[PDB]
From a paper:
The structure-specific nuclease, flap endonuclease-1 ([name]) plays a vital role in maintaining genome integrity by precisely processing intermediates of Okazaki fragment maturation, long-patch excision repair, telomere maintenance, and stalled replication forks. [name] preferentially binds to double flap substrates with a one nt 3′-flap and any length of 5′-flap, including zero. It catalyses a single hydrolytic incision one nucleotide (nt) into dsDNA to yield nicked DNA ready for direct ligation. Here crystallographic analyses uncover an unprecedented electrostatic steering of an inverted 5′-flap through the human [name] (hFEN1) helical gateway.
In the hFEN1-[name] and hFEN1-R100A structures, the ssDNA (5′-flap) region of the substrate threaded through the tunnel formed by the gateway/cap. In the hFEN1-[name] structure, two basic residues of the gateway/cap, Arg104 and Lys132, were within 4–7 Å of the +1, +2 and +3 phosphodiester. In the hFEN1-[name] structure, we were surprised that the scissile phosphate was within catalytic distance of the active site while surrounding bases remained basepaired to the template strand. In striking contrast, the scissile phosphodiester bond was directly coordinated to the one active site metal ion in the hFEN1-[name] structure. Furthermore, the +1 and −1 nts remained unexpectedly basepaired to the template strand, which is shifted relative to the other substrate structures via a dsDNA distortion surrounding the scissile phosphodiester. There is no base stacking between −1 and −2 nts in the 5′-flap strand; instead, an unusual interstrand base stacking interaction occurs between the −2 nt of the 5′-flap strand and the template strand opposite of the −1 nt. In concert with the DNA rotation in hFEN1-[name], Tyr40 is in a different rotamer conformation from all other substrate or product bound or DNA-free hFEN1 structures. The Tyr ring is fully stacked on the +1 base, and its side chain hydroxyl forms a hydrogen bond to the +1 phosphate. In the hFEN1-[name]-substrate structure, cap and gateway helices 4 and 5 are shifted 1–3 Å towards the dsDNA relative to all other hFEN1 crystal structures with DNA. Close examination of the hFEN1-[name] structure revealed a water molecule 3.3 Å from the scissile phosphate.
Residue numbers in the entry: 2 to 342
Write the structure that this text describes.
Amino acid sequence: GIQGLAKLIADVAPSAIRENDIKSYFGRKVAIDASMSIYQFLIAVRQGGDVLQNEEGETTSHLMGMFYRTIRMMENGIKPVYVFNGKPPQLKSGELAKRSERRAEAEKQLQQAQAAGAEQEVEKFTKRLVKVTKQHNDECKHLLSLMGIPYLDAPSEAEASCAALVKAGKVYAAATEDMDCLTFGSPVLMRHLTASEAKKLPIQEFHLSRILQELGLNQEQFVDLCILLGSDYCESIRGIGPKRAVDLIQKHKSIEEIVRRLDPNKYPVPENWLHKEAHQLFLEPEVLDPESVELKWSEPNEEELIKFMCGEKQFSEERIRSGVKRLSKSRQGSTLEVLFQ
DNA sequence: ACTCTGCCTCAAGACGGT
DNA sequence: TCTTGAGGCAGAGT
DNA sequence: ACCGTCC
Ligand SMILES: [K+]
Ligand SMILES: [Sm+3]
Ligand SMILES: [Sm+3]
Ligand SMILES: [Sm+3]
Ligand SMILES: [Sm+3]
Ligand SMILES: [Sm+3]
């Protein structure tokens, strides 16, 4: 995302953050980042260091989490649409390689401590070596379709497509922890949305217009600010962080002017910088067309869900049947059936 | 006194009885 | 084949 | 709400 954007907004633009009870969101539509949910489920949903699976050796944690979390959201009257990632931008390749180094300095580290006998360490590095594959995304898509829950394939970054679904009024906000969703123009971002029987953090909304108001900036200047803070698509200036970049943009209003108004002896510019291409990518991303698909929450298919979850993935039939009943009853309570005119 | 580097470390769920 | 976030601290730079 | 368990 963006380096320490949430803290900056908290300290400088406190009015941009608003908190509301889960019970106030009945009847609202949200766009969820699915890949992040899958990472969460694959990391957390495990027992004894091993992930939930069937006899064929196939992971099922992502299905556990997707199923139950989705049902809970529906029970609270929240209608979600999962947005899946697409082709990553080439500007991100750099970052996409550095996150690979974090894996390189992990798999090799899972060989000396896996032979030493330290359980908890092995569990840690194993958790750090989790990667979401296409089989995960496809089994999740299948499950959602069997549940009647709509999903959309983004052409590139799912965060930008979410931002476009909000910009177009198709949903109210994007449920993601990806803060650069605000740089793609998402008028509202929602954090901490799980709706659990033992809830923890409060649901918080970041409103873009309030951010721009408190900072006294427009979308272009804000994108430049986020480029200076630390994006995933280009480099940041060495030695310039939040406090300095805020004043620099509040005073000079652009990166071009900043470069044309600084002493290179103190703050040098990165070699072969791509700040204009990142500015462009953020202001005008590759995004699906929201007017194409109209979102529908349809009746779940109970029989196929039993054959898939219980027959193939070996979930308990009682829990699944009761869950489907809960889902159909909540959808009954929150959605109006089709009216032909 | 601020502020940023540049490292280091860490983290990511839910159910059905009690 | 593709997700992210948050601190703490020594030390130099402002 | 805690805690063994989910697959
Ligand atoms: K920086
Ligand atoms: Sm992102
Ligand atoms: Sm199979
Ligand atoms: Sm190293
Ligand atoms: Sm089978
Ligand atoms: Sm009907």
